[PDB]
From a paper:
For [name].1 and [name].6 capsid structures were generated from 512,823 and 539,729 particles, resulting in final maps with resolutions of 1.79 and 1.77 Å, respectively. The amino acid sequence could be readily built to the density maps, starting from amino acid 198 for [name].1 and 217 for [name].6 which is comparable to all previous AAV capsid structures. On the other hand, [name].6 is more similar to AAV9, with 98% aligned residues; however, significant differences such as in VR-IV, where [name].6 has a 7-amino-acid deletion, resulted in an overall Cα-RMSD of >1 Å. The two porcine AAVs show little similarity in the surface loop structure and are as different to each other as AAV5 is to other AAVs that have been isolated from human tissues. The [name].6 demonstrated an even larger preference for galactose binding, roughly 3-fold higher in Lec-2 as opposed to Pro-5 cells. [name].6 shares four of these residues except for N470, which is substituted to serine (S460), whereas only N272 and Y446 are conserved in [name]. In contrast, [name].6 shares many amino acids around the 2-fold depression. The equivalent residues in the [name].6 capsid are K481, D552, and N696, explaining why the 2-fold antibodies did not recognize the capsid. Due to the higher similarity of [name].6 in the 5-fold region, both antibodies bound the capsid, but mAb1-6 only with lower affinity. [name].6 crosses the BBB in pigs, a trait of significant interest for gene therapy.
Author numbering:
A (entry chain x): 669 to 726
B (entry chain S), C (entry chain A), D (entry chain c): 217 to 726
Amino acid sequence: VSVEIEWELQKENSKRWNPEVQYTSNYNKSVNVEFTVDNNGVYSEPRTIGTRYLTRNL
Amino acid sequence: ADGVGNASGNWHCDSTWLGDRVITTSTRTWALPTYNNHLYKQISSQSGANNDNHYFGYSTPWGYFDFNRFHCHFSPRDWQRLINNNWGFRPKRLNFKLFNIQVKEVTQTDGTKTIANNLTSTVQVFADSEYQLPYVLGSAHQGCFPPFPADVFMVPQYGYLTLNNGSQAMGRSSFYCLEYFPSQMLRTGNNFTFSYTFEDVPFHSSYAHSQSLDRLMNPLIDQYLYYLSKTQNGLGFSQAGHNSMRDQSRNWLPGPCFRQQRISKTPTQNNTGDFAWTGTTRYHLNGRNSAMNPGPAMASHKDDEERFFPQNGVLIFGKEDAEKNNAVLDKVIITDEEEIRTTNPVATGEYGLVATNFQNNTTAADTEMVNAQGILPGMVWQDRDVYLQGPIWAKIPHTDGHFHPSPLMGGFGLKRPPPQILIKNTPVPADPATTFNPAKLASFITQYSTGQVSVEIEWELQKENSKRWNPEVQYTSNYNKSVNVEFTVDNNGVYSEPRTIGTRYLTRNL
Amino acid sequence: ADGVGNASGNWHCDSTWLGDRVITTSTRTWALPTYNNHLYKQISSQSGANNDNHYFGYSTPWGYFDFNRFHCHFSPRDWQRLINNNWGFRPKRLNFKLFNIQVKEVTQTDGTKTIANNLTSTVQVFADSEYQLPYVLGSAHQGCFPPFPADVFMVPQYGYLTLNNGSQAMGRSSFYCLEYFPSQMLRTGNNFTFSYTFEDVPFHSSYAHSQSLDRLMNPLIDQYLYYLSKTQNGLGFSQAGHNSMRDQSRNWLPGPCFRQQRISKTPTQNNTGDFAWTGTTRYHLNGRNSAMNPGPAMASHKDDEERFFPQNGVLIFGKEDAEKNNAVLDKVIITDEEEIRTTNPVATGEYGLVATNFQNNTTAADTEMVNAQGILPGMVWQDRDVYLQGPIWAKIPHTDGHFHPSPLMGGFGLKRPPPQILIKNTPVPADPATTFNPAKLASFITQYSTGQVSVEIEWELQKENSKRWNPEVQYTSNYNKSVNVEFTVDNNGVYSEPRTIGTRYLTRNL
Amino acid sequence: ADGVGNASGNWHCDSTWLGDRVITTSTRTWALPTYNNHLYKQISSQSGANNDNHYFGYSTPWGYFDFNRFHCHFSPRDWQRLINNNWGFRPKRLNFKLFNIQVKEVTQTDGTKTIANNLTSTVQVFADSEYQLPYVLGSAHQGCFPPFPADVFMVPQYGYLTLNNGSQAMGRSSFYCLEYFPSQMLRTGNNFTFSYTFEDVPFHSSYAHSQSLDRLMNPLIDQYLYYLSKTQNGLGFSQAGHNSMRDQSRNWLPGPCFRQQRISKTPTQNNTGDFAWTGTTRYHLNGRNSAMNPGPAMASHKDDEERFFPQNGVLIFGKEDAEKNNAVLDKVIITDEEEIRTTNPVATGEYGLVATNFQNNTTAADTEMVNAQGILPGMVWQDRDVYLQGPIWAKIPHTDGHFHPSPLMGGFGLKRPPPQILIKNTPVPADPATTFNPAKLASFITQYSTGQVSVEIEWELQKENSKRWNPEVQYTSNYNKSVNVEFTVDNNGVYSEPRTIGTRYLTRNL
């Protein structure tokens, strides 16, 4: 079974000077890589990821 | 843009009444200092402040122009023409111009100040037309064009707030550098012009209802519907009619309310303790309390109660000589929303009574007051009135949802309001050292600027088509003699606005 | 070029992101003194100087404009947009403008300074577009456009060096008179514009490898090739596989290295003597020693050694309040090249081990460390990263030969770089004597100039096409509360860059 | 794509010699199991492994096709035709086809296996043409097309490595899901075709020099230049000539070298200890040591030393019956690079001698050996030879810099090499439960697939234009009688490649 979805995007036009908060992987070493399979082939989603990172004025 | 000896604009101050439109034009003289000694600064509340009062933000070297009050554009006579003859009005478009720029340099010397023209200095100006900066118009700040066209005013300094946690900042807090925008640079020969079109908005309602929501029926005829008129010794049902209007079935409901405390203009009728804060109605947001002022549109008092007003529920203006802090009642002017008592609950009362239990042979029927009531289907209401000295528009916050976005201080809610116009004196360094120093320059020539500014607004009018036989109420000057004439200068040249003037005089049926 | 009362340019400071391009525009206010009291001067080192430090050259009355750092053109947010989303970028073209020229005269008088406009004075400017002058951009000097657009800066003085023998000069030493060039002369109404196109250069690599050069094989499958796995009691040969990756045959070699001394950020782990000079790696040229700083691109430390850094092998920036001399470790920011450890040797280790003898029945096999290794066929390497506060380009020396001319401090090597832009206040003599004197005039009116300068650069971007499933590392602000916001002004108006920001976040396979 | 009873391709195995081109075509029969029971798995080294051997990566359910050895495409006779007649060759283009797909299902039952056709099952295949996956071809792994066209081979399993720190992973480590690519799905009637064009690459040099770099002069004539021929009792200078060739001035230098240990094929001439690891030349990368095998192209031995070979410096192939671990010398075939001794240093010697001090009246002149020497201007060298059983191409790592990217195991360096072709049996679930279970399905029908695969490569040839009078050396079979014929099957049907065959037979001047 296949499903294709087209999504429309709204770009960011901010004049903010300082850097934004951004979703990032941890750069440090670890036993497993987040959002991958383990040694037994089980895929896992370690954490939830929302959408709200960039900012906007009221 | 010609040069030193040629004026770059003329004085346009006028009002033109054309049919279903009125065009106001206003010109004033302004003066702009150097703010913050050219620097941006982080600003925040002190450690000892109440949590409700903490903040974090920045002050900028820029100034900005604010024409967001009705008396910037309408003379008192013009306002009278508007409100006595029209059921509604709204803004349509505007033009803005900055001209006759003059830059001055000030030198302290030994004992006295010396002022001279700096012919080669520039001022910078830009309009934030993409709404990329925090929008501080619409907070009812001072610094507008003065109501009397001969008065000269100081341009206010621009600053803004961002996310705070106590007195500190959060990672998502934003810092804006206004030099990171394109801006026009003006020498004394140059000028700046901007034009803008208002988005469609509904007419402000300048009228009062001549009917109340609970008396919309024909007083001569009974209803065909029945209500429960008797419980004692068995149920009984009756058709309501002219002798019981409180019992008739109806199609609509009064508007929402959030009840406020009741203050008396008679001093002996008030409690003598300190309830100024504890008596206010407040909203709780991220651990901080804010007064809900003025809050939802609600009538100020009911019939024959005109001595009372809601504690935080009405706009209050100062008289010309009023102090900034702890002015007495006689020095302020309290607006009165009584005209909306036909559709809106009184601000200091309950919405109504709701049933709380199940009545039976052994249990009486119980009710309790509802002091805060949100929207219900079938509700109708009027928004707060606008005033000659009150605000005009506000920016609707950019959010997923809002409901009926009429700004609660009154006026027109706009998604894309008139843009902020920012202005700054370009810094002119004093003589630098003759050996290279990498530090940023800290030594500047003392300067300020002055010029004229004009704004033209086209307003659309909604005419009155009433069949009312008897004369209307109308706003009028008093015809009797007096020591001064209202809305004029006194013997010392001080202009004053003696009273507030709303818009609701003509009437309309529900 | 119109005249006194008309601005000759506008403030353009913006960034525009279009598809595979980003256009930065930067404007600043500058001030230029008179340098050297209008004179050219021979300058040289003192007799007592160390031979390594001798020099001979000239200082000129001219100043020059330097925009050769990334933070001149990119706000911190813009830099974030760049590095989180793109695998590479390079400059394409630029425009330069000098405008709103103001010339001031200063008079000492009796007790206080007086400053006035000199409307008829001129400033001279020219771009050395034929590269006829010594090119001093690209030496990482101070005096650039400040990173924060509201700061005002002093234009640095131009000087240069030529051949020296000790403190003396050689017959082939060159002297350049900058008045022997054509230059434009500007009064307060005039402006100057220059445009330039960058030569084709490879994209900077803004990415880290997600593989290391020694792990490029399929871990599931053995090699068909054999290696010598056993010498004891006779030779034996094996096919390497997942359990011995150190033995597999490979196609490529790590990049070159020149080993440097290892410094610890933990104070007690360092020797307490004076090795600051004697510990550095140096090159010997015409009898003079120069530190090799930063030297070849090499990784700063290996895994889990992040407390160590190479003595002369990394760029080091000061914090805002750092002293010029002998600042402590906590006052500086040390860059970290660890991302290139996948292809490049660690700066503080050996390249490897080489065989030194012939083994036999009576003689064991011997090896020794190779601490300096030049290029070999089959080597691959990454160049040093670029930083928000680091340099952009350098002029490739004009020579018969060079190899891989990526400037070692980082950035883009250019045969024909952006030309030097030279500027000077034209001398205005004071009143001469009324009897002819042939001596050159020594008495001048004290003057300085100020104005605005703008530079626009178009950058080409290389997009990321990765099939990586899991999320990338990304540069981010901290989300927690803090007393100040990073990369902003403080309560006194001082802008500061708290940390260095490299370009290597996204990943790519080898 | 017609259906069950129609073949989807024909057997194409041929070689066509046309002028300056040769087209090889190769077809084989393959079999593909289910790998990893359909799962992706994280794989890593054990805790007890040597740091040099740690790794982190993933094994995938996919297989892949590898034709990256010369004997996949050239019969031994064809290779002879190539090397005896041509000075060079390079690949130009290729076509790939997968066809006659058959999917089988296996059932265990009670005592014996049962195999049947699954007519509706599919296999998935795609070519990674954008180079988005780790490229594991070019590591000399097993699993290629077998050299003898009648042999049937198992498709090898695809896996890859990413960044490791010890046995753990780093944030920048990448995970790739191959189902996140588009792929063609084939039932038994379907086929797959792919075509590719090689990028321009230089011809492999199939020739040996008939001159050595140190004898390029005219032996009959003296030089006009002088050298220092006498120091004793005063300096003296002479013109070099035929009797002193070691003293003549020359224009060029031998190629670079990194010296390796010397192993004897005579067992008693070797040390009896364990130097297998400690004797190797190694590079040090991010704390890990890797043998430099084969390393820079260097001649295996000097004249009359043919019993010696460099420890880690030559390709070594197994004889047909060689063990995987600790095979004795008689069971392996050691390649010999002696033909490049004309321009390249011998692998087991020094590059030369360098001066270390300043000679004077009291101090003798000193030199020392240089055992590792990088590139110098004026160097020339030959790259390593290619072999009938050796690799063809390798992917040049994607990096800022590389030098002379000829892969060190031999063959053609390619920025955009022939893409990896990945293939997998689509999983077919067994009967699921009749009540919904959200867990992923763990129970599958046991299947494998088989089919034919073809690859056609067009090669460009560089002809020989020599004026040499005397006959060349040529690769030849032995003409004498023998029990078996070289490069054939034996009485049991085992094909074997008895010896390695290089390309360098014809000669050319320097």
